[PDB]
């Protein structure tokens, strides 16, 4: 397929960054369509590690033009910092990065509001990444937020920013009783880069329609995971954007009927960082093993990620919401050495019923217990294996089982962090 | 196609309600996926006029199950009032209406906030429908809003509502200096209907996945229009939800790859109610004619709708954003008697350039001038005509021209408000 979508089927950090970079070899465009700099996508090329947050994962390839779609909430400060670091490493960012004038801006007050609301929550804290993502999306919906296109007229931008910060400071000071954000600093910091950002502006939706008609290859890079979806995730312990396949159209302008293949990134086990329901969560020795062996620490906040067994029930919800075409199984190599591996095949509800569908809101998850299916592990090392013939039978039965429970094939299997430690059984672009 | 989407290609009120009702004869399900009671869809069956707002337009057919998807922001009070009026007219609503537990709730304070923000805007007022739609979507994104699923546990709902209204009253009273909303009235009013609403709850996304596998016919009914889209419309003079095709997936849970045919509702001329850029707007005799002859008054607010010539440039943007499969031209009959009709074929930018694409944000529209293409009108009456052979050549050349400029065929032509005053050249379900 020409238009391929790569997204997380779980709670994020399934290894989307790696897959995007790997598959962009054949793409002309790579587009980010939701989220902001709370995303942390790690790429490892020949041992070199790059961690992108706002900039699309195809930025290291000179043959691809990276595009930050309108769905993304842009932090001018976050962008600059990343652009610089990359430019210092021989990546001519400005030469290959384009962005939407419709992207909402994340400013200093958004971060101030983020930390404030979180402290006001107390024990009910979401455990956000503190990047002001929520407040930015909120200003957008309320129709008072500032967008990239506003930077085109400096005087009116100053007047608009004037109004918005008046409102935001009143609540930060009077209600949340925190520090006011200085209007002049924000105004100065923004204008200092206003021209850099605006020089990269392009009509994304029209461009994507052009690419489509020519039949160019375009890859959509998702941020976060399905269960963090603002509508369908474990509300209110979710992110403020639609992390599901529908976010592709709203966040880039591409018509829904043009999405040809949706690739779901599936980790061999499960992780979640931040508060919220997590049925298969392990609090024992095996949990520590997955964390250590998988080096599960926040690519953005450095927070230790919560680990657990793969949840087939939750994944099936992901298959359905995104109309998945196939999966890419990652971190299979981390499971090496375990005597047994478990797959949650159903949920035991607090009322005794055994269900195979997931609860919606976070509150409806309280009391849910996973119903496992234990399988034999493998002693053989799968790390770096680049062909099925290198995987132990136990590992193969494990792949097959997931396919059986889900009904979706595993087209790609990743056995290590490097771009090459992978095995493509089927290329989505050819599917 | 089994899964058909019906949406407005302009600024709403293109006559979506009529088309949904007409086409639901063959559908098992009809789903609303965005907006709330700001929508006003008029149906006229054998002269009988029904105006729905929150309830799906397939509610008059006993063979269809209406579903209010998670994207919709639900006003418990608005629903009850509509359910009652319909039940009094022999429509067993409760027997055929289902809804999502994920739908955010529109409460009294949301309406209070709506009117307040609008007055604070002054001359920069959006001209909202005052139904609290914006504030409801804002609470959702901020992850502090209450959803239908919250009504399942009355005690915790009271505690949650307690927190949210504390926050909302502080700003309404202290900042906006308006009246506080009484917590007890809202709590009482809500609980009085809490059980009615919860009895209608269904897992929408799972159900739609079931319908899909069986191959049932499902129709998605859009609210508002493309140019009112929160991301891609004339921001900030937009509605707070995604009115484009991508909203179907995020607002119902159906995977993007399952949308088979997107039908764009296209009015013969243009209307817009409320503030915002409108290039082809007429302020002369012909404007008054279109308003009078088309009886252009708000189906929800009673506001006189602004009229103008059909804007081909803006419509082309709609074709692209929604991946339209075909159009349904409505109110052709209103153009009867005009000596000449005009089609805006391109825009004259304030800098002298002639463009064929539309500006994004509302500010980038200031100064834009329409470039017309004049065509001869027709004296013949097309009202009620149910076959192409009843349309005067001039009317036929007009249909053809729109098809030529757009590149999308006109599969349905509506020549009057009644369900039968229509001509289906092609049924989307068979396409
Ligand atoms: O916080 C980190 O360091 C994680 C972020 C994982 C994905 N992820 C987010 O980007 N945000 C998260 O979603 C929730 C809402 O926070 P926010 O509004 O900042 O996105 C939080 O649980 C937050 O942890 C969330 O789970 N990194 O491993 C991402 O590379
Ligand atoms: O206000 C009315 O009476 C119109 C509503 C037309 C569609 N429409 C909306 O539902 N809202 C509108 O979108 C903008 C945002 O308002 P709101 O947040 O209430 O949706 C306003 O211009 C408002 O008029 C808008 O244009 N009716 O003809 C709809 O049946
Ligand atoms: N062991 C192992 N690590 C992997 C594999 N694929 C990716 N990773 C690493 O797993 C982590 C994925 O989390 P993150 O970087 O947040 O990925 P993203 O946010 O989903 O793109 C990164 O540190 C990667 O280097 C794999 O197949 N095996
Ligand atoms: N004259 C005429 N009126 C029509 C036609 N189709 C629909 N209408 C009327 O046009 C109006 C459409 O606006 P509205 O009710 O807001 O429709 P919706 O919001 O798009 O579903 C209604 O009053 C309909 O009865 C048509 O073909 N001809
Ligand atoms: Mg990450
Ligand atoms: Mg209407």
PDB file of N, CA, C and O in Angstrom, chain B residues 187-212:
ATOM      1  N   UNK B 187     -27.230  18.336  40.062  1.00  0.00           N
ATOM      2  CA  UNK B 187     -27.180  16.990  40.611  1.00  0.00           C
ATOM      3  C   UNK B 187     -28.551  16.320  40.618  1.00  0.00           C
ATOM      4  O   UNK B 187     -28.661  15.135  40.306  1.00  0.00           O
ATOM      5  N   UNK B 188     -29.584  17.074  40.985  1.00  0.00           N
ATOM      6  CA  UNK B 188     -30.945  16.544  41.040  1.00  0.00           C
ATOM      7  C   UNK B 188     -31.493  16.263  39.659  1.00  0.00           C
ATOM      8  O   UNK B 188     -32.027  15.178  39.409  1.00  0.00           O
ATOM      9  N   UNK B 189     -31.373  17.244  38.772  1.00  0.00           N
ATOM     10  CA  UNK B 189     -31.855  17.111  37.402  1.00  0.00           C
ATOM     11  C   UNK B 189     -31.214  15.914  36.693  1.00  0.00           C
ATOM     12  O   UNK B 189     -31.906  15.127  36.036  1.00  0.00           O
ATOM     13  N   UNK B 190     -29.908  15.746  36.886  1.00  0.00           N
ATOM     14  CA  UNK B 190     -29.172  14.657  36.259  1.00  0.00           C
ATOM     15  C   UNK B 190     -29.610  13.290  36.778  1.00  0.00           C
ATOM     16  O   UNK B 190     -29.910  12.394  35.991  1.00  0.00           O
ATOM     17  N   UNK B 191     -29.615  13.120  38.097  1.00  0.00           N
ATOM     18  CA  UNK B 191     -30.002  11.845  38.699  1.00  0.00           C
ATOM     19  C   UNK B 191     -31.431  11.419  38.375  1.00  0.00           C
ATOM     20  O   UNK B 191     -31.737  10.224  38.342  1.00  0.00           O
ATOM     21  N   UNK B 192     -32.299  12.397  38.150  1.00  0.00           N
ATOM     22  CA  UNK B 192     -33.695  12.136  37.815  1.00  0.00           C
ATOM     23  C   UNK B 192     -33.813  11.371  36.498  1.00  0.00           C
ATOM     24  O   UNK B 192     -34.802  10.674  36.263  1.00  0.00           O
ATOM     25  N   UNK B 193     -32.804  11.499  35.641  1.00  0.00           N
ATOM     26  CA  UNK B 193     -32.824  10.817  34.354  1.00  0.00           C
ATOM     27  C   UNK B 193     -31.667   9.839  34.182  1.00  0.00           C
ATOM     28  O   UNK B 193     -31.616   9.103  33.199  1.00  0.00           O
ATOM     29  N   UNK B 194     -30.764   9.813  35.155  1.00  0.00           N
ATOM     30  CA  UNK B 194     -29.595   8.942  35.116  1.00  0.00           C
ATOM     31  C   UNK B 194     -29.881   7.510  34.695  1.00  0.00           C
ATOM     32  O   UNK B 194     -29.123   6.929  33.912  1.00  0.00           O
ATOM     33  N   UNK B 195     -30.974   6.951  35.203  1.00  0.00           N
ATOM     34  CA  UNK B 195     -31.334   5.569  34.900  1.00  0.00           C
ATOM     35  C   UNK B 195     -31.875   5.366  33.492  1.00  0.00           C
ATOM     36  O   UNK B 195     -31.723   4.291  32.912  1.00  0.00           O
ATOM     37  N   UNK B 196     -32.559   6.375  32.967  1.00  0.00           N
ATOM     38  CA  UNK B 196     -33.109   6.285  31.618  1.00  0.00           C
ATOM     39  C   UNK B 196     -31.962   6.186  30.625  1.00  0.00           C
ATOM     40  O   UNK B 196     -31.971   5.340  29.732  1.00  0.00           O
ATOM     41  N   UNK B 197     -30.995   7.090  30.783  1.00  0.00           N
ATOM     42  CA  UNK B 197     -29.828   7.158  29.921  1.00  0.00           C
ATOM     43  C   UNK B 197     -28.998   5.901  29.996  1.00  0.00           C
ATOM     44  O   UNK B 197     -28.616   5.349  28.965  1.00  0.00           O
ATOM     45  N   UNK B 198     -28.687   5.458  31.205  1.00  0.00           N
ATOM     46  CA  UNK B 198     -27.864   4.270  31.346  1.00  0.00           C
ATOM     47  C   UNK B 198     -28.479   2.977  30.832  1.00  0.00           C
ATOM     48  O   UNK B 198     -27.754   2.032  30.510  1.00  0.00           O
ATOM     49  N   UNK B 199     -29.803   2.933  30.731  1.00  0.00           N
ATOM     50  CA  UNK B 199     -30.483   1.733  30.250  1.00  0.00           C
ATOM     51  C   UNK B 199     -30.263   1.577  28.757  1.00  0.00           C
ATOM     52  O   UNK B 199     -30.403   0.476  28.218  1.00  0.00           O
ATOM     53  N   UNK B 200     -29.917   2.682  28.097  1.00  0.00           N
ATOM     54  CA  UNK B 200     -29.671   2.698  26.659  1.00  0.00           C
ATOM     55  C   UNK B 200     -28.212   2.474  26.261  1.00  0.00           C
ATOM     56  O   UNK B 200     -27.903   2.356  25.078  1.00  0.00           O
ATOM     57  N   UNK B 201     -27.329   2.375  27.246  1.00  0.00           N
ATOM     58  CA  UNK B 201     -25.905   2.186  26.989  1.00  0.00           C
ATOM     59  C   UNK B 201     -25.534   0.900  26.267  1.00  0.00           C
ATOM     60  O   UNK B 201     -26.043  -0.175  26.581  1.00  0.00           O
ATOM     61  N   UNK B 202     -24.633   1.023  25.294  1.00  0.00           N
ATOM     62  CA  UNK B 202     -24.138  -0.126  24.534  1.00  0.00           C
ATOM     63  C   UNK B 202     -22.671   0.131  24.178  1.00  0.00           C
ATOM     64  O   UNK B 202     -22.225   1.279  24.216  1.00  0.00           O
ATOM     65  N   UNK B 203     -21.900  -0.934  23.969  1.00  0.00           N
ATOM     66  CA  UNK B 203     -20.486  -0.798  23.582  1.00  0.00           C
ATOM     67  C   UNK B 203     -20.509  -0.534  22.076  1.00  0.00           C
ATOM     68  O   UNK B 203     -20.485  -1.464  21.274  1.00  0.00           O
ATOM     69  N   UNK B 204     -20.613   0.737  21.702  1.00  0.00           N
ATOM     70  CA  UNK B 204     -20.699   1.104  20.297  1.00  0.00           C
ATOM     71  C   UNK B 204     -19.624   0.554  19.372  1.00  0.00           C
ATOM     72  O   UNK B 204     -19.956  -0.049  18.348  1.00  0.00           O
ATOM     73  N   UNK B 205     -18.352   0.759  19.705  1.00  0.00           N
ATOM     74  CA  UNK B 205     -17.290   0.283  18.828  1.00  0.00           C
ATOM     75  C   UNK B 205     -17.312  -1.220  18.618  1.00  0.00           C
ATOM     76  O   UNK B 205     -17.060  -1.685  17.506  1.00  0.00           O
ATOM     77  N   UNK B 206     -17.627  -1.986  19.661  1.00  0.00           N
ATOM     78  CA  UNK B 206     -17.691  -3.443  19.510  1.00  0.00           C
ATOM     79  C   UNK B 206     -18.891  -3.817  18.631  1.00  0.00           C
ATOM     80  O   UNK B 206     -18.768  -4.624  17.716  1.00  0.00           O
ATOM     81  N   UNK B 207     -20.033  -3.181  18.876  1.00  0.00           N
ATOM     82  CA  UNK B 207     -21.250  -3.419  18.098  1.00  0.00           C
ATOM     83  C   UNK B 207     -21.018  -3.125  16.611  1.00  0.00           C
ATOM     84  O   UNK B 207     -21.466  -3.890  15.748  1.00  0.00           O
ATOM     85  N   UNK B 208     -20.362  -1.999  16.316  1.00  0.00           N
ATOM     86  CA  UNK B 208     -20.072  -1.615  14.928  1.00  0.00           C
ATOM     87  C   UNK B 208     -19.106  -2.602  14.285  1.00  0.00           C
ATOM     88  O   UNK B 208     -19.106  -2.778  13.078  1.00  0.00           O
ATOM     89  N   UNK B 209     -18.259  -3.222  15.091  1.00  0.00           N
ATOM     90  CA  UNK B 209     -17.342  -4.216  14.551  1.00  0.00           C
ATOM     91  C   UNK B 209     -18.138  -5.507  14.233  1.00  0.00           C
ATOM     92  O   UNK B 209     -17.829  -6.232  13.284  1.00  0.00           O
ATOM     93  N   UNK B 210     -19.189  -5.758  15.012  1.00  0.00           N
ATOM     94  CA  UNK B 210     -20.063  -6.925  14.819  1.00  0.00           C
ATOM     95  C   UNK B 210     -20.856  -6.740  13.528  1.00  0.00           C
ATOM     96  O   UNK B 210     -20.952  -7.650  12.704  1.00  0.00           O
ATOM     97  N   UNK B 211     -21.439  -5.555  13.380  1.00  0.00           N
ATOM     98  CA  UNK B 211     -22.228  -5.205  12.209  1.00  0.00           C
ATOM     99  C   UNK B 211     -21.402  -5.320  10.938  1.00  0.00           C
ATOM    100  O   UNK B 211     -21.874  -5.800   9.915  1.00  0.00           O
ATOM    101  N   UNK B 212     -20.150  -4.898  11.036  1.00  0.00           N
ATOM    102  CA  UNK B 212     -19.218  -4.905   9.923  1.00  0.00           C
ATOM    103  C   UNK B 212     -18.959  -6.332   9.467  1.00  0.00           C
ATOM    104  O   UNK B 212     -19.057  -6.648   8.287  1.00  0.00           O
TER     105      UNK B 212
END
